[PDB]
Design a protein around this ligand. Structure first.
Ligand SMILES: O=C(N/N=C/c1ccc(Sc2ccccn2)o1)c1cccc(F)c1
Length: 257
């Protein structure tokens, strides 16, 4: 694209793969009730799969772990499949054509229901989650709410864009981004799933797309991408603490990024 700055996000360990929730380590680190945190994480993981299994063809695409939604865009005989019954087909060159049908359908539901999730999963299944969010953000001090301020401050920039790089399979990552509210700030074409190939392959897959005329900045938590972002001359912005986000937003408000 014509974007000048690219912000790569690694929201695992905090948002996408919040494995600190189920392990109970989050409650130990931050002095919260362990049992309450585990219950909220297990319910979230259910609401996600109940959304993915009933709308994004999870059970079909569990092993067919692609890396980008447009990865198999070559084999799609582009046709109006509004009547195509996915439950009654030879699914279990002719298979890749059937496989691409689902990814285009996944994209259609994504781009349609990212600001209307009650239309995808009917209400009150959205009201149940909005209740689930506040119950968790009361433990994380509105971490997802805080991170969206930095995401919208970048999405609102015409020269800047933000992309997502997680290690989950693409479909669950799309389900989490859809529910959690990150759909407005992460375009579906800017979400990469480093499941089988590692984050380095995804980082290299990005720079070939946005070119050498762009300024790449990596925002994440951990060290797995620390060397992965250093070996590609991408400045790493740690994001562990809460003040790290206020400073990040501060550094964004003053055009330092
Ligand atoms: O909020 C979400 N995560 N937060 C994570 C995380 C880790 C560390 C911190 S900072 C902090 C400050 C004080 C007390 C506790 N934490 O936040 C979340 C994630 C996914 C879905 C959702 F709906 C919500």
């Amino acid at each position: 694209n014509e974007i000048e700055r690219v912000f790569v996000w690694d929201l695992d360990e905090t948002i996408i793969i919040f494995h600190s929730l189920l392990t109970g380590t989050f409650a130990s680190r931050y002095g919260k009730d362990t049992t309450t945190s585990v219950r909220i994480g297990l319910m979230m993981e259910e609401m996600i799969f109940n959304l993915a299994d009933t709308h994004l063809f999870f059970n079909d695409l569990e092993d067919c772990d692609q890396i980008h939604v447009d990865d198999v865009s070559s084999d799609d005989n582009g046709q109006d499949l509004s009547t195509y019954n996915f439950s009654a087909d030879g699914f279990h060159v002719d298979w890749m054509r059937k496989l691409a049908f689902r990814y285009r359908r996944v994209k259609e539901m994504y781009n349609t229901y990212k600001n209307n999730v009650g239309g995808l999963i009917g209400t009150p299944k959205r009201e149940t989650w909005l209740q689930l969010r506040a119950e968790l953000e009361a433990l994380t001090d509105l971490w997802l709410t805080h991170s969206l301020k930095a995401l919208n401050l970048i999405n609102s920039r015409p020269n800047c864009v933000n992309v997502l790089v997680t290690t989950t399979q693409l479909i669950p990552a799309l389900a989490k981004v859809l529910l959690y509210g990150l759909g407005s700030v992460f375009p579906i074409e800017n979400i990469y799933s480093a499941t089988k190939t590692g984050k380095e392959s995804c980082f290299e897959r990005i720079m070939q797309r946005f070119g050498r005329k762009a300024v790449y900045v990596v925002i994440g938590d951990g060290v797995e991408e620390e060397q992965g972002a250093k070996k590609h001359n991408m400045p790493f912005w740690r994001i562990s603490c809460h003040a790290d986000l206020e400073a990040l937003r501060h550094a964004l408000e003053l055009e330092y990024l």
